[PDB]
Structures are given as C-alpha cells and as structure tokens.
Ligand binder design. Structure first.
Ligand SMILES: *Cc1c(COP(=O)(O)O)cnc(C)c1O
Ligand SMILES: *Cc1c(COP(=O)(O)O)cnc(C)c1O
Lengths: 334, 338
C-alpha cells in the first residue's frame, strides 16, 4: 500500500514560510546489494523540496531575515553577494519578499540560466570579467562597498554564522523525523553551513552521532590537500570556510567527480529520485558507510542539496553507464 | 511579523511517491496591492510545484499507474506508453521508476529537449517523431505501436482517464482542510481538466456555493465554444474539450491572453517572490480579476499554480522586461473593462 501526503493544515503567510520541513525518504533501489543488510536504513533528506529547489533557500532566508531583525539590513540599504549559484537565487527570493534590492556579482561567463532566474526575481546582476572567475566578482563587490559605504549588506555566505544557524532547523527535522534513531549524517560540503549546523544541533541531542563531510577527491581541502579542478558543482570551494568547525566533523570522505555523477545517475534510474551532483557524492559516501560491518542496522541520513533539473546543461546525464544495476553498484563501491 | 518556517514532517517516506500531494497554500500580498482589491478578500495560491518533480502532474502520473496496477490494467511484462512532451511524461517516468515498469514517451523530436533529457534520466524510452507533424505525429506513432503490439502497452491516456480526475479529490481535500472549510472560489487553468473537475466534484460535496472557475487562453477558447487557435500559455489550451471535462461542475470560464499570462507570472515572482509558470500567470490573473468584483469582498479565493518558472527558462517568459512600478504593472493587468 502506498499513501500520498496528507494536507499540511496551514496557510502560509508568504513563500519563506514554506522553507524547511523537507522530506526524509528511504532509498531502496541503490541499496539493493548483498553487503547492505536489511536492517541498515539509508535515508535521503531532499532539500530541493524548498521553494527554489535547494538547501540554500534556508541560508538566503536566515541571513537576510536575521540582518533585518538585527539592524544590519535597514530601509534604503541593498543586499549584495558574489555568487553564481543557489545562494544567489535564495538571496533573490528573500529580497523579493522583504522588499530589498538584491545585487548579485558573478563572472559574465557563468550560468546564463541562473542569471535569468536571478533577474526574474528583480536582482541587479554585476557581471564581472570571465577570466578572473569568482575572485573577480568578489573584487567588484569590495569596490562597490568601498565607493558606497553604508549602502550594502554583504551576505558573506562562507563567513556568516547565520548560514550555520539555519541548519539547526535541518538538524531538528532529522531528529524528529527519525524519532531520535539517526546514527550517521552525511553532508557534501560547500559553505559547510549544513554539516556544521546539523552537527552542532544533533550533538546537543546525542553525542554519539557520527558526522561525515564529503568533498571532491580532486579538491580535498578539508583533508589538507590543495584546491584543484573538479566537476562536483556546489561543493569543493577550494578553501576552508570561516564557518567550518573541524571539531564537529568525525570523518571526511573524498569522492571522485565521475563517481558522484555516476551515483546521481543510478539514484534517479533505480529510486526515481532526481538528485544533483553533490547529492551523488553524499549518497555514494553513505552507501560506502552502509556496507561497513560495524554499521549494520544503523540509520544513515544523507543530505540531498539540489535536483538534477538544474544540471541539464552540464555533463551529468551525458555519459551512459554500462551494465546491470548490481554491476553499476559494484563499480561505484569498488 | 514573526516569519516562521515549516515544521518537521514527522514522517519517513517509503519512497518518493509518498511525497506527492499535500502541497502548500500560500497567501499572495504583493500582487494584490491595487485599489480595486479589498483588504478583506484572501487570495491564496496552491503551489503544485512542491510535488517531487515540480508539477501538478506528479499526482496524475502516480494515480494513473497506481490505480492501473491495483485494477490489473497494468501487470508485470507490460510497459507504460503515452504521447506527451510535457509534465505528464515526467510524472509517468517517476511512477514507472518506483513501481519497476518501463515507460515509453512519444513526442516530436524538436519539442522540449530539456524534458527529453529529464525523461531519459529516469530510464524512459523516447519515441521521437517527425517535428513538422507535432503532437498528432506522436499520437499516430503510439497508435501504431499499440496496434502492432496488442496487450503489451498500458496507455496513460491523460485526457480521457478517470484516474486523472480522481487524483484531484486529494487536491480538493487539501484545499478544504487548509482553509478550514472557508474556501469560496477555486481558479484552475485547464489542460486535461483533471484538476478543475476533480476539485469541483469533491468540494461541491463539502458546501453549497463554492464557485469553480476554469481558465483558458483567449486565443484558443474551446471550453467557451470558440475555435482552437495558436497561443503561448504552455500546459493549457489543448485545442479540444477533454473527455474527462464535465461542464456541469464549472461555474465560469475566464479567457486570458498569452501576453497577460506571462506578465502576471513575471509580476508574481518579482513582487511575491513566487516563481510560478505560464499557466499559473493565467490562473492568478483570473483570480485577481475575481478578487476585484464587489460580490467577492471578503471571500477566500484559491488559485492552482501547476508549475515553476525554472521549467520555462528557454521560453520568452522572462525575456520581456516590464517597464514600470508595481502599481503600473498591476493596473495594466487589471485594466480591461466589461
Ligand atoms: C550549497 C550547496 C551544497 C553544500 O551545502 P553547504 O551547506 O554550503 O555546505 C551542496 N550542493 C549544492 C548544489 C549546494 O548549492
Ligand atoms: C497539466 C498542467 C496544467 C493544467 O492542469 P490540468 O489538471 O491538466 O487541467 C496547467 N499547467 C501546467 C504546466 C500543466 O502541466
């Protein structure tokens, strides 16, 4: 028997109130492996259920809403951030609701898709020199702040603890949804707001929970390697964010870009869940935990930051995989 | 005011299909700020893009496949087929993936390449038909395939399948529960008509006096008895009256111009921060038109929002950049006289 969702029994005052309370869903297709025991539970928390389909919805909202409550953002000021991704979308959504102008700086070469999304929300785009990358976008933001003191609130996603703090809700949802049974949480790391915010709130609930960060093998900076070229969009920032707190992270798992994409392909094919690239990374790390003998019967929760639809212009679904399901899962796990 | 985000669901879903439905009902504020709309009337949008694949059709793909499995119309060995280049294709692929059935989707080779990619990701077999022939070419090929392979295929038949309409009794129950029975008017832009009919069937059981409004393109006003015509409101205006349409359940039909549907959608995202799709712009505009009627003062108006704007980035939806303040834009959208 299969029951769909019941009424929410709420009228939301605006779209920001629909942020969070994201669903926790059992994996079955990709967990069908002789070495993963029946009792081991592998669950994915689908952050693309947020109104703009990513985990960053929580971040854009909390950063802006807190700044407004704080007086760090007040009438006549504008929001600014250098970002070409989900954070920019999330800031645009918050700014639209609150009635604050949003300025997003990114290299002109970037996501013309996400550019259009940001413009649709009424953002002013600051398109910087393509060859200078994100450093060039940050550079222009700093120049604008210098020339206009008092005008701008900078979101500062990698240094702002309102990022981290938003994920106390993420943690509370994992705790409640699992009835306190969660044993391990796996999170692919971009800003690190999720892994740290979740870790600190869950540790408050149960010290024994294992917290696993995931990063690209090609840019394993949390593990002390250097910034390198990789293809896992949304993670591998190439530095350790100021909001990172190593004390709260129990293990770091490196995942190859190609394996993350291949995992994401298997998850949509065998579970009907259209996860993004970083989710492929997290889920593979989670499956690797799930086959460990010391983890038999444990409840493993894996954060899924975004949906595959935001990746159609990428190479994510371009490579075809050879073999049967078990062949594909063996190739990922070996 | 205090802004509070959503509480935990307090559920572990056995699979992705269990996350379908129970979509949020959200107040509009920004686009309702016009002198002709009274403070007391409540204008709400039901955001069907909260479904796992971001459209109302998740309910339809699911219920069509599930009810067919339960009935025995779909059984092991058979494959699912449908000619569709829209959201129904995606919803069938999602259902097929979870239930473990092959899904065959037919569409013109030139139509929605992005959602072609989405469907293939889900493991669907794409039947790409001659571009110039359009959807009739796709329907023709599905017809050929089922004729040659009797018993092999289960046809979803979205425009004639009572399981489409039936799925919307849940949509109706959600509207009913979320409004504490206060809902007065439901506005739905019509594609298959599953939503407007299924909602009407169930709500008309709850209380007398709930006004059911269908919305269609001004250019293809076939429900109002006008002739089929070219229009740009993706997801609606099929050009015919679907077999599941029941005119007795519909109180009024509102035609909306393509250009106005787009402009409304642009306004909703900019002033309410809600990224609704094209057909949503049509439904919302119709809803605001209801909200300005004096007989509707203080009523609760519920507008179906079938899809999100991100599915429209390759269209002209956001290419036109409206000049003018919020009040000029809203005033220009409501200014038609009748
Ligand atoms: C932000 C993001 C992440 C990482 O989440 P953090 O909380 O920033 O570490 C992973 N994937 C995608 C697609 C993201 O946008
Ligand atoms: C299906 C659909 C509609 C219309 O809903 P019906 O229940 O088929 O009438 C409107 N917009 C979009 C984008 C759709 O996919």
């Amino acid at each position: 028997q299969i029951s769909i969702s019941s009424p929410r029994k709420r009228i939301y005052h605006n779209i920001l109130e629909t942020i969070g309370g994201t669903p926790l869903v059992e994996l079955h297709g990709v967990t069908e492996h002789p070495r993963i025991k029946k009792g081991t539970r592998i669950l994915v928390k689908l952050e693309y259920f947020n109104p703009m389909s990513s985990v960053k919805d929580r971040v854009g909202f909390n950063i802006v809403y807190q700044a407004i409550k704080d007086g760090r953002l007040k009438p006549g000021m504008e929001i600014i951030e250098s970002t070409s991704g989900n954070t920019g979308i999330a800031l645009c959504q918050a700014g639209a609701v609150f009635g604050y102008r949003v300025n997003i700086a990114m290299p002109s070469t970037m996501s013309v898709e996400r550019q259009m999304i940001m413009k649709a929300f009424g953002a002013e785009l600051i398109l910087t020199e393509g060859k200078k990358g994100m450093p060039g976008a940050i550079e222009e933001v700093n120049k604008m702040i210098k020339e206009n003191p008092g005008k701008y609130f900078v979101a500062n996603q990698f240094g702002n603890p309102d990022n981290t703090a938003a994920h106390h809700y993420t943690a509370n949802e994992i705790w409640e949804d699992t009835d306190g049974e969660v044993d391990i949480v796996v999170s692919a790391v971009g800003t690190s707001g999720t892994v740290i915010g979740v870790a600190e709130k869950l540790k408050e609930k149960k010290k024994g929970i294992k917290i696993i960060a995931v990063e690209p093998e090609e840019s394993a900076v949390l593990e002390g390697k250097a910034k390198g070229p990789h293809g896992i969009q949304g993670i591998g920032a190439g530095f350790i964010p100021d909001i990172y707190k190593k004390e709260f992270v129990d293990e770091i798992i490196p995942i190859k870009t190609q394996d993350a994409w291949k995992m994401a392909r298997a998850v949509v094919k065998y579970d009907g869940i259209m996860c993004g690239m970083s989710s492929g990374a997290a889920i593979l790390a989670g499956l690797k935990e799930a086959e460990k003998p010391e983890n038999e019967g444990k409840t493993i929760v894996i954060i899924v930051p975004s949906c595959g639809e935001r990746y159609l212009s990428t190479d994510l679904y371009k490579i075809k995989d050879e073999g049967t399901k078990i062949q594909i899962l063996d190739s990922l796990l070996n």
